[PDB]
Short mmCIF file of all heavy atoms in Angstrom, two decimals:
data_model
loop_
_atom_site.label_atom_id
_atom_site.label_comp_id
_atom_site.label_asym_id
_atom_site.label_seq_id
_atom_site.Cartn_x
_atom_site.Cartn_y
_atom_site.Cartn_z
N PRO A 1 -48.49 -31.72 -146.25
CA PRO A 1 -48.27 -33.05 -146.82
C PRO A 1 -48.72 -34.14 -145.87
O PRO A 1 -48.50 -34.06 -144.68
CB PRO A 1 -46.72 -33.11 -146.94
CG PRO A 1 -46.22 -31.70 -146.82
CD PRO A 1 -47.21 -31.00 -145.95
N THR A 2 -49.44 -35.13 -146.42
CA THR A 2 -49.96 -36.22 -145.57
C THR A 2 -48.91 -37.10 -144.97
O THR A 2 -49.18 -37.90 -144.07
CB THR A 2 -51.09 -37.05 -146.25
OG1 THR A 2 -50.55 -37.66 -147.42
CG2 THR A 2 -52.33 -36.15 -146.64
N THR A 3 -47.65 -37.00 -145.49
CA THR A 3 -46.50 -37.64 -144.84
C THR A 3 -46.05 -36.92 -143.56
O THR A 3 -45.30 -37.48 -142.76
CB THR A 3 -45.30 -37.87 -145.84
OG1 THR A 3 -44.92 -36.60 -146.41
CG2 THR A 3 -45.69 -38.83 -147.00
N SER A 4 -46.49 -35.66 -143.37
CA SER A 4 -46.26 -34.96 -142.11
C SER A 4 -47.47 -35.13 -141.23
O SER A 4 -48.51 -35.60 -141.77
CB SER A 4 -46.12 -33.43 -142.41
OG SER A 4 -44.87 -33.18 -143.09
N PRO A 5 -47.37 -34.86 -139.92
CA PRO A 5 -48.55 -34.85 -139.10
C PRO A 5 -49.69 -33.96 -139.66
O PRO A 5 -49.39 -32.86 -140.08
CB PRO A 5 -48.08 -34.37 -137.75
CG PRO A 5 -46.63 -34.86 -137.69
CD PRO A 5 -46.14 -34.66 -139.08
N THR A 6 -50.90 -34.50 -139.67
CA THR A 6 -52.06 -33.79 -140.18
C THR A 6 -53.17 -33.69 -139.12
O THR A 6 -53.09 -34.42 -138.10
CB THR A 6 -52.60 -34.38 -141.46
OG1 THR A 6 -52.84 -35.79 -141.32
CG2 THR A 6 -51.60 -34.17 -142.64
N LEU A 7 -54.17 -32.88 -139.34
CA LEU A 7 -55.39 -32.89 -138.53
C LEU A 7 -55.99 -34.27 -138.44
O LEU A 7 -56.38 -34.71 -137.41
CB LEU A 7 -56.39 -31.85 -139.07
CG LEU A 7 -56.20 -30.39 -138.69
CD1 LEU A 7 -56.90 -29.50 -139.65
CD2 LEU A 7 -56.61 -30.11 -137.28
N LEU A 8 -56.04 -34.96 -139.62
CA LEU A 8 -56.60 -36.33 -139.69
C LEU A 8 -55.73 -37.31 -138.90
O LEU A 8 -56.32 -38.15 -138.11
CB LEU A 8 -56.70 -36.76 -141.14
CG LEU A 8 -57.35 -38.14 -141.41
CD1 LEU A 8 -58.78 -38.21 -140.88
CD2 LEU A 8 -57.37 -38.44 -142.90
N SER A 9 -54.41 -37.30 -138.99
CA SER A 9 -53.55 -38.26 -138.33
C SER A 9 -53.50 -38.02 -136.83
O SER A 9 -53.57 -38.95 -136.02
CB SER A 9 -52.15 -38.29 -138.95
OG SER A 9 -51.41 -37.13 -138.62
N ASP A 10 -53.37 -36.77 -136.42
CA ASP A 10 -53.04 -36.36 -135.09
C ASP A 10 -54.17 -35.87 -134.19
O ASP A 10 -54.05 -35.91 -132.97
CB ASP A 10 -51.85 -35.39 -135.09
CG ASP A 10 -50.55 -36.03 -135.29
OD1 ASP A 10 -50.43 -36.92 -136.19
OD2 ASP A 10 -49.55 -35.72 -134.62
N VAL A 11 -55.24 -35.39 -134.79
CA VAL A 11 -56.39 -34.81 -134.06
C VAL A 11 -57.62 -35.58 -134.25
O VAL A 11 -58.32 -35.89 -133.28
CB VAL A 11 -56.53 -33.30 -134.36
CG1 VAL A 11 -57.65 -32.71 -133.53
CG2 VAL A 11 -55.27 -32.52 -134.11
N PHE A 12 -57.97 -36.00 -135.48
CA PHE A 12 -59.23 -36.72 -135.72
C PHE A 12 -59.07 -38.05 -136.50
O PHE A 12 -59.74 -38.24 -137.51
CB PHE A 12 -60.21 -35.80 -136.51
CG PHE A 12 -60.43 -34.46 -135.89
CD1 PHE A 12 -60.05 -33.31 -136.61
CD2 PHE A 12 -61.03 -34.33 -134.66
CE1 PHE A 12 -60.26 -32.02 -136.07
CE2 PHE A 12 -61.22 -33.06 -134.09
CZ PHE A 12 -60.83 -31.93 -134.80
N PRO A 13 -58.21 -38.99 -135.96
CA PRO A 13 -58.02 -40.28 -136.71
C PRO A 13 -59.30 -41.11 -136.90
O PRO A 13 -59.40 -41.80 -137.90
CB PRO A 13 -57.03 -41.02 -135.83
CG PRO A 13 -57.11 -40.40 -134.48
CD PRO A 13 -57.39 -38.96 -134.76
N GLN A 14 -60.27 -41.00 -135.97
CA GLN A 14 -61.53 -41.72 -136.00
C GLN A 14 -62.40 -41.42 -137.29
O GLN A 14 -63.30 -42.17 -137.61
CB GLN A 14 -62.31 -41.52 -134.71
CG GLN A 14 -62.97 -40.15 -134.52
CD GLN A 14 -62.06 -39.03 -134.00
OE1 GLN A 14 -60.82 -39.19 -133.95
NE2 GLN A 14 -62.69 -37.95 -133.59
N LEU A 15 -62.10 -40.31 -137.96
CA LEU A 15 -62.82 -39.89 -139.13
C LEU A 15 -62.43 -40.71 -140.40
O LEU A 15 -63.10 -40.61 -141.42
CB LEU A 15 -62.66 -38.41 -139.42
CG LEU A 15 -63.32 -37.47 -138.41
CD1 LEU A 15 -63.16 -35.98 -138.84
CD2 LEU A 15 -64.77 -37.76 -138.12
N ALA A 16 -61.32 -41.42 -140.34
CA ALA A 16 -60.85 -42.26 -141.41
C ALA A 16 -60.73 -43.74 -140.89
O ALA A 16 -59.81 -44.06 -140.21
CB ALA A 16 -59.53 -41.78 -141.97
N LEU A 17 -61.67 -44.52 -141.33
CA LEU A 17 -61.84 -45.94 -140.89
C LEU A 17 -60.60 -46.78 -141.00
O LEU A 17 -60.20 -47.43 -140.00
CB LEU A 17 -63.01 -46.61 -141.58
CG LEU A 17 -64.41 -46.17 -141.16
CD1 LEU A 17 -65.44 -46.90 -142.01
CD2 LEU A 17 -64.66 -46.43 -139.69
N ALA A 18 -60.06 -46.83 -142.22
CA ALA A 18 -58.90 -47.64 -142.53
C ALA A 18 -57.58 -47.13 -141.95
O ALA A 18 -56.62 -47.93 -141.81
CB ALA A 18 -58.74 -47.68 -144.07
N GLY A 19 -57.55 -45.88 -141.55
CA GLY A 19 -56.33 -45.22 -140.99
C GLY A 19 -56.13 -43.88 -141.69
O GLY A 19 -56.75 -43.56 -142.62
N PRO A 20 -55.12 -43.11 -141.16
CA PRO A 20 -54.80 -41.81 -141.82
C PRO A 20 -54.23 -41.96 -143.18
O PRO A 20 -53.56 -42.98 -143.46
CB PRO A 20 -53.72 -41.22 -140.87
CG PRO A 20 -53.08 -42.42 -140.20
CD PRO A 20 -54.18 -43.46 -140.07
N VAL A 21 -54.51 -41.00 -144.05
CA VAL A 21 -53.84 -41.01 -145.36
C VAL A 21 -52.42 -40.52 -145.16
O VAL A 21 -52.27 -39.47 -144.53
CB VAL A 21 -54.67 -40.17 -146.38
CG1 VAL A 21 -53.96 -40.10 -147.70
CG2 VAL A 21 -56.03 -40.79 -146.58
N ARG A 22 -51.47 -41.26 -145.70
CA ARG A 22 -50.06 -40.94 -145.56
C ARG A 22 -49.39 -41.26 -146.87
O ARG A 22 -48.82 -42.35 -147.07
CB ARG A 22 -49.49 -41.78 -144.39
CG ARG A 22 -48.04 -41.42 -144.00
CD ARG A 22 -47.63 -42.20 -142.74
NE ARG A 22 -48.14 -41.62 -141.51
CZ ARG A 22 -49.22 -42.05 -140.84
NH1 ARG A 22 -49.86 -43.16 -141.24
NH2 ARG A 22 -49.62 -41.43 -139.74
N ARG A 23 -49.51 -40.33 -147.83
CA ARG A 23 -49.08 -40.51 -149.20
C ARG A 23 -48.26 -39.32 -149.68
O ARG A 23 -48.66 -38.19 -149.45
CB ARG A 23 -50.26 -40.73 -150.11
CG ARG A 23 -51.30 -41.75 -149.70
CD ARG A 23 -51.82 -42.59 -150.86
NE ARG A 23 -52.74 -41.86 -151.77
CZ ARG A 23 -54.07 -42.02 -151.83
NH1 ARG A 23 -54.72 -42.82 -150.95
NH2 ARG A 23 -54.77 -41.30 -152.71
N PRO A 24 -47.16 -39.59 -150.45
CA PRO A 24 -46.37 -38.44 -150.94
C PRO A 24 -47.09 -37.52 -151.91
O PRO A 24 -46.78 -36.33 -152.00
CB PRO A 24 -45.15 -39.12 -151.64
CG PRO A 24 -45.66 -40.49 -152.02
CD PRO A 24 -46.58 -40.87 -150.89
N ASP A 25 -48.08 -38.11 -152.60
CA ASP A 25 -48.90 -37.37 -153.58
C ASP A 25 -50.28 -36.92 -153.08
O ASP A 25 -51.17 -36.62 -153.90
CB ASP A 25 -49.03 -38.20 -154.87
CG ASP A 25 -49.75 -39.52 -154.63
OD1 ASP A 25 -49.80 -40.03 -153.47
OD2 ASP A 25 -50.21 -40.13 -155.62
N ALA A 26 -50.42 -36.82 -151.77
CA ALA A 26 -51.64 -36.35 -151.16
C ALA A 26 -51.34 -35.28 -150.07
O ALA A 26 -50.45 -35.54 -149.21
CB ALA A 26 -52.51 -37.46 -150.61
N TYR A 27 -51.99 -34.14 -150.13
CA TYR A 27 -51.89 -33.06 -149.15
C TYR A 27 -53.23 -32.87 -148.44
O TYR A 27 -54.27 -33.08 -149.04
CB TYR A 27 -51.45 -31.74 -149.75
CG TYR A 27 -50.00 -31.55 -150.02
CD1 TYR A 27 -49.12 -32.62 -150.40
CD2 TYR A 27 -49.41 -30.24 -150.02
CE1 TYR A 27 -47.77 -32.44 -150.64
CE2 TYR A 27 -48.04 -30.06 -150.29
CZ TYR A 27 -47.25 -31.16 -150.62
OH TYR A 27 -45.91 -30.97 -150.89
N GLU A 28 -53.16 -32.47 -147.18
CA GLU A 28 -54.39 -32.08 -146.44
C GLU A 28 -54.64 -30.60 -146.48
O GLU A 28 -53.75 -29.76 -146.17
CB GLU A 28 -54.26 -32.49 -144.95
CG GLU A 28 -55.51 -32.36 -144.15
CD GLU A 28 -55.31 -32.65 -142.69
OE1 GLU A 28 -54.66 -31.77 -141.98
OE2 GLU A 28 -55.75 -33.70 -142.23
N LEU A 29 -55.85 -30.25 -146.91
CA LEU A 29 -56.29 -28.88 -146.97
C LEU A 29 -56.95 -28.51 -145.64
O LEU A 29 -57.74 -29.28 -145.13
CB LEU A 29 -57.31 -28.63 -148.10
CG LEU A 29 -56.86 -28.99 -149.53
CD1 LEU A 29 -58.04 -28.80 -150.49
CD2 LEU A 29 -55.71 -28.15 -149.94
N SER A 30 -56.64 -27.29 -145.14
CA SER A 30 -57.28 -26.75 -143.97
C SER A 30 -57.25 -25.23 -143.97
O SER A 30 -56.62 -24.59 -144.84
CB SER A 30 -56.66 -27.28 -142.65
OG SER A 30 -55.25 -27.03 -142.58
N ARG A 31 -57.96 -24.63 -143.04
CA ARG A 31 -57.97 -23.16 -142.83
C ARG A 31 -58.37 -22.35 -144.14
O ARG A 31 -57.68 -21.45 -144.51
CB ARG A 31 -56.70 -22.63 -142.19
CG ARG A 31 -56.41 -23.21 -140.81
CD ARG A 31 -57.44 -22.79 -139.75
NE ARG A 31 -56.87 -22.87 -138.40
CZ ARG A 31 -56.67 -24.01 -137.70
NH1 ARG A 31 -57.03 -25.17 -138.25
NH2 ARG A 31 -56.17 -23.97 -136.50
N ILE A 32 -59.43 -22.87 -144.79
CA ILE A 32 -59.99 -22.10 -145.88
C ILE A 32 -60.78 -20.94 -145.30
O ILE A 32 -61.57 -21.07 -144.38
CB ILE A 32 -60.85 -22.94 -146.83
CG1 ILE A 32 -61.19 -22.22 -148.12
CG2 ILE A 32 -62.14 -23.47 -146.11
CD1 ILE A 32 -62.05 -22.96 -149.13
N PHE A 33 -60.54 -19.72 -145.84
CA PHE A 33 -61.36 -18.60 -145.49
C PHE A 33 -61.42 -17.55 -146.58
O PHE A 33 -60.47 -17.50 -147.45
CB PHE A 33 -60.94 -17.94 -144.19
CG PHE A 33 -59.64 -17.18 -144.26
CD1 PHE A 33 -59.57 -15.86 -144.63
CD2 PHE A 33 -58.40 -17.88 -143.99
CE1 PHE A 33 -58.35 -15.15 -144.72
CE2 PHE A 33 -57.20 -17.18 -144.10
CZ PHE A 33 -57.15 -15.84 -144.46
N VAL A 34 -62.46 -16.76 -146.53
CA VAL A 34 -62.57 -15.54 -147.33
C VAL A 34 -63.02 -14.48 -146.30
O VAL A 34 -63.89 -14.72 -145.49
CB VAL A 34 -63.66 -15.68 -148.41
CG1 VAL A 34 -63.94 -14.36 -149.08
CG2 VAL A 34 -63.17 -16.66 -149.46
N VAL A 35 -62.34 -13.33 -146.23
CA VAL A 35 -62.79 -12.23 -145.33
C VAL A 35 -64.17 -11.76 -145.71
O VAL A 35 -64.58 -11.88 -146.84
CB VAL A 35 -61.77 -11.05 -145.30
CG1 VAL A 35 -60.41 -11.52 -144.89
CG2 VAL A 35 -61.73 -10.35 -146.68
N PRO A 36 -64.99 -11.28 -144.70
CA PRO A 36 -66.38 -10.91 -144.94
C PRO A 36 -66.65 -10.07 -146.20
O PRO A 36 -67.62 -10.35 -146.91
CB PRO A 36 -66.80 -10.19 -143.69
CG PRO A 36 -66.01 -10.89 -142.62
CD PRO A 36 -64.67 -11.19 -143.24
N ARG A 37 -65.78 -9.11 -146.48
CA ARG A 37 -65.83 -8.20 -147.61
C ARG A 37 -65.88 -8.84 -148.96
O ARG A 37 -66.36 -8.25 -149.94
CB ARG A 37 -64.63 -7.26 -147.64
CG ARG A 37 -64.56 -6.15 -146.65
CD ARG A 37 -63.47 -5.19 -147.00
NE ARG A 37 -62.12 -5.79 -146.77
CZ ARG A 37 -61.22 -5.96 -147.75
NH1 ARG A 37 -61.45 -5.62 -148.99
NH2 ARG A 37 -60.02 -6.49 -147.43
N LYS A 38 -65.35 -10.04 -149.08
CA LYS A 38 -65.26 -10.73 -150.37
C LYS A 38 -66.10 -11.99 -150.49
O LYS A 38 -66.02 -12.74 -151.45
CB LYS A 38 -63.79 -11.00 -150.75
CG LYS A 38 -63.04 -9.76 -151.22
CD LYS A 38 -63.54 -9.28 -152.57
CE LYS A 38 -62.57 -8.31 -153.26
NZ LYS A 38 -63.16 -7.89 -154.53
#
């Protein structure tokens, strides 16, 4: 949840000009993967 600390808020704030997104209806996606077999 963007109301919790996120990669954007806490690690890469410079990537969002206006500031971190901090909204109850917005989540941050991370760690997408598919194992090599699939």
Side-chain angles (χ1 to χ4, degrees):
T2 61
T3 58
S4 292
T6 53
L7 280 159
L8 185 61
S9 74
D10 282 42
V11 183
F12 309 117
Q14 74 277 14
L15 294 184
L17 286 177
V21 174
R22 187 173 282 103
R23 311 217 289 255
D25 61 340
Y27 280 32
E28 189 187 73
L29 303 176
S30 58
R31 299 295 202 283
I32 193 182
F33 71 89
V34 171
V35 301
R37 284 190 292 117
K38 285 292 195 181

